[PDB]
Design an enzyme around this catalytic site. Structure first.
Site, PDB file in Angstrom:
ATOM      1  N   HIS A  70      53.123  89.976  25.777  1.00  0.00           N
ATOM      2  CA  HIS A  70      53.006  91.383  25.547  1.00  0.00           C
ATOM      3  C   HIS A  70      52.885  91.364  24.023  1.00  0.00           C
ATOM      4  O   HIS A  70      52.251  92.152  23.545  1.00  0.00           O
ATOM      5  CB  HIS A  70      54.148  92.359  26.150  1.00  0.00           C
ATOM      6  CG  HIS A  70      54.204  92.276  27.508  1.00  0.00           C
ATOM      7  ND1 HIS A  70      53.405  92.400  28.447  1.00  0.00           N
ATOM      8  CD2 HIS A  70      55.211  91.669  28.017  1.00  0.00           C
ATOM      9  CE1 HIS A  70      53.652  92.216  29.886  1.00  0.00           C
ATOM     10  NE2 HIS A  70      54.828  91.783  29.457  1.00  0.00           N
ATOM     11  N   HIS A 103      59.150  93.000  16.370  1.00  0.00           N
ATOM     12  CA  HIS A 103      57.841  92.795  16.936  1.00  0.00           C
ATOM     13  C   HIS A 103      56.845  93.741  16.436  1.00  0.00           C
ATOM     14  O   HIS A 103      57.379  94.641  15.601  1.00  0.00           O
ATOM     15  CB  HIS A 103      57.889  92.534  18.380  1.00  0.00           C
ATOM     16  CG  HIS A 103      58.184  93.957  18.994  1.00  0.00           C
ATOM     17  ND1 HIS A 103      59.228  94.406  19.267  1.00  0.00           N
ATOM     18  CD2 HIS A 103      57.188  94.910  19.323  1.00  0.00           C
ATOM     19  CE1 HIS A 103      59.443  95.773  19.981  1.00  0.00           C
ATOM     20  NE2 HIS A 103      58.152  96.170  19.836  1.00  0.00           N
ATOM     21  N   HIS A 144      53.088  95.697  17.346  1.00  0.00           N
ATOM     22  CA  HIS A 144      51.830  96.334  18.206  1.00  0.00           C
ATOM     23  C   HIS A 144      50.507  96.186  17.174  1.00  0.00           C
ATOM     24  O   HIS A 144      50.497  96.812  16.029  1.00  0.00           O
ATOM     25  CB  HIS A 144      52.097  97.640  19.009  1.00  0.00           C
ATOM     26  CG  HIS A 144      53.465  97.550  19.635  1.00  0.00           C
ATOM     27  ND1 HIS A 144      53.489  97.568  20.959  1.00  0.00           N
ATOM     28  CD2 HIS A 144      54.549  97.829  19.180  1.00  0.00           C
ATOM     29  CE1 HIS A 144      54.798  97.408  21.201  1.00  0.00           C
ATOM     30  NE2 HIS A 144      55.547  97.566  20.319  1.00  0.00           N
ATOM     31  N   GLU A 203      51.218 102.620  17.431  1.00  0.00           N
ATOM     32  CA  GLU A 203      51.718 103.180  18.588  1.00  0.00           C
ATOM     33  C   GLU A 203      51.923 104.763  18.201  1.00  0.00           C
ATOM     34  O   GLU A 203      51.387 105.698  18.740  1.00  0.00           O
ATOM     35  CB  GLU A 203      53.049 102.696  18.999  1.00  0.00           C
ATOM     36  CG  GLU A 203      52.688 101.184  19.534  1.00  0.00           C
ATOM     37  CD  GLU A 203      53.614 100.851  21.062  1.00  0.00           C
ATOM     38  OE1 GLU A 203      55.000 100.842  20.470  1.00  0.00           O
ATOM     39  OE2 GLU A 203      53.005 100.545  21.809  1.00  0.00           O
ATOM     40  N   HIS A 251      58.165  97.183  14.904  1.00  0.00           N
ATOM     41  CA  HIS A 251      59.317  97.618  15.589  1.00  0.00           C
ATOM     42  C   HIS A 251      60.529  96.616  15.399  1.00  0.00           C
ATOM     43  O   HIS A 251      60.539  95.472  15.747  1.00  0.00           O
ATOM     44  CB  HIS A 251      59.204  97.974  16.962  1.00  0.00           C
ATOM     45  CG  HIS A 251      58.349  99.007  17.200  1.00  0.00           C
ATOM     46  ND1 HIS A 251      57.565  99.082  18.380  1.00  0.00           N
ATOM     47  CD2 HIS A 251      57.599  99.991  16.363  1.00  0.00           C
ATOM     48  CE1 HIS A 251      56.904 100.082  18.417  1.00  0.00           C
ATOM     49  NE2 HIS A 251      56.851 100.678  17.289  1.00  0.00           N
ATOM     50  N   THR A 305      58.484 101.805  24.435  1.00  0.00           N
ATOM     51  CA  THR A 305      57.160 101.986  24.544  1.00  0.00           C
ATOM     52  C   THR A 305      56.346 101.128  25.475  1.00  0.00           C
ATOM     53  O   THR A 305      54.911 101.174  25.669  1.00  0.00           O
ATOM     54  CB  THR A 305      56.347 101.885  23.181  1.00  0.00           C
ATOM     55  OG1 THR A 305      56.434 100.736  22.787  1.00  0.00           O
ATOM     56  CG2 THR A 305      57.079 102.962  22.159  1.00  0.00           C
TER      57      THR A 305
HETATM   58  N1  LIG Z   1      58.007  98.621  21.648  1.00  0.00           N
HETATM   59  S1  LIG Z   1      59.841  98.965  21.908  1.00  0.00           S
HETATM   60  O1  LIG Z   1      59.868 100.344  22.376  1.00  0.00           O
HETATM   61  O2  LIG Z   1      60.275  98.712  20.784  1.00  0.00           O
HETATM   62  C1  LIG Z   1      60.406  97.984  23.199  1.00  0.00           C
HETATM   63  C2  LIG Z   1      59.982  97.685  24.405  1.00  0.00           C
HETATM   64  C3  LIG Z   1      60.687  96.714  25.124  1.00  0.00           C
HETATM   65  C4  LIG Z   1      61.839  96.125  24.512  1.00  0.00           C
HETATM   66  C5  LIG Z   1      62.612  95.123  25.097  1.00  0.00           C
HETATM   67  C6  LIG Z   1      63.008  95.202  26.387  1.00  0.00           C
HETATM   68  N2  LIG Z   1      64.013  93.893  26.125  1.00  0.00           N
HETATM   69  C7  LIG Z   1      64.106  93.643  24.940  1.00  0.00           C
HETATM   70  C8  LIG Z   1      64.817  92.600  24.315  1.00  0.00           C
HETATM   71  O3  LIG Z   1      64.480  92.294  23.198  1.00  0.00           O
HETATM   72  N3  LIG Z   1      65.562  91.857  25.206  1.00  0.00           N
HETATM   73  C9  LIG Z   1      66.476  92.250  25.756  1.00  0.00           C
HETATM   74  C10 LIG Z   1      66.432  92.412  27.162  1.00  0.00           C
HETATM   75  O4  LIG Z   1      65.238  91.969  27.764  1.00  0.00           O
HETATM   76  C11 LIG Z   1      64.659  90.602  27.235  1.00  0.00           C
HETATM   77  C12 LIG Z   1      65.106  90.524  25.542  1.00  0.00           C
HETATM   78  O5  LIG Z   1      63.382  94.380  24.223  1.00  0.00           O
HETATM   79  S2  LIG Z   1      61.672  96.950  22.834  1.00  0.00           S
HETATM   80 ZN   LIG Z   2      57.355  97.865  20.230  1.00  0.00          ZN
END
Ligand SMILES: NS(=O)(=O)c1ccc(-c2cnc(C(=O)N3CCOCC3)o2)s1
Ligand SMILES: [Zn+2]
Length: 257
Positions: A61, A91, A93, A103, A116, A195
């Protein structure tokens, strides 16, 4: 099965993740004229000098630079936040073209990319528990525009060859995220969500007003990544951004006059 294609992209997410149409979804458009200066907002406190990066991962992703979050080593405090939030990963986008990729938007303007820096509230013990809480996460959002190169991004750019495809990871120690910050810490803040699925409504968003500049060559290297795994048909990892969602019953606050 969710992703960013015509058949599985943001318009489809609500079928598996009904919270996609929820009351505090991210990202949003930041209407600069409607955001209210909030003099009671503390200065933001970014303490990354002891940060310990470990690994870089293509997760299909985006790519994550992951940090050791088993102690208080790199924390975000102050601003709109109560307590201490620990850096777990960052990370980006980005777009297939310089004219899109972020975003969040600012007065409908899209930036070429958005960084982010994801942090979790230490009161909840770990990231997994934090995402189940309305104040579990603090994500620091930083816009990227294309111009001069960002020297502090280059170590990230140069490792991307080794993690081209989904599920590939590489050792990535001693990376200093302070190299990715702009000069000013002026910000907008609002309550929102992850997101991407599971789109949990657990994030205090802190979005910096000042973008960083990256070079065309730097962003081009992001666009050479793949969404697919090795030995599968090549689909370039581009346009991995969710569009702006309805603000609904939320106010965006500014840290600055
Ligand atoms: N675009 S964002 O809103 O910043 C975002 C979307 C999804 C994220 C997510 C999910 N899990 C994690 C992570 O880093 N981990 C923790 C548990 O899941 C796997 C690894 O990050 S961070
Ligand atoms: Zn993000």
């Amino acid at each position: 099965h969710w992703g960013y294609g015509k058949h599985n992209g943001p318009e489809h997410w609500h079928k598996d993740f009904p919270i996609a149409k929820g009351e505090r979804q991210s990202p949003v458009d930041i209407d600069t004229h409607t955001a209210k200066y909030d003099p009671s907002l503390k200065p933001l406190s970014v303490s990354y000098d002891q940060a310990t990066s470990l690994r870089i991962l293509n997760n299909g992703h985006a790519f994550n630079v992951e940090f050791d979050d088993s102690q208080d080593k790199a924390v975000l405090k102050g601003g709109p936040l109560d307590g201490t939030y620990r850096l777990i990963q960052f990370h980006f986008h980005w777009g297939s073209l310089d004219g899109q990729g972020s975003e969040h938007t600012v007065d409908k303007k899209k930036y070429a990319a958005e960084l982010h820096l994801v942090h979790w509230n230490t009161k909840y013990g770990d990231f997994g528990k934090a995402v189940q809480q309305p104040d579990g996460l603090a994500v620091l959002g930083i816009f990227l525009k294309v111009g001069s190169a960002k020297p502090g991004l280059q170590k990230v750019v140069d490792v991307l060859d080794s993690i081209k495809t989904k599920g590939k990871s590489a050792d990535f120690t001693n990376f200093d995220p302070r190299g990715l910050l702009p000069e000013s810490l002026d910000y907008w803040t609002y309550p929102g969500s992850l997101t991407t699925p599971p789109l949990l409504e657990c994030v205090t968003w802190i979005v910096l007003k000042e973008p960083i500049s990256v070079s065309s060559e730097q962003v081009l290297k992001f666009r050479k990544l793949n969404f697919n795994g090795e030995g599968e048909p090549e689909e370039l990892m581009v346009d991995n951004w969710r569009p702006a969602q309805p603000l609904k019953n939320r106010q965006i606050k500014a840290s600055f006059k």
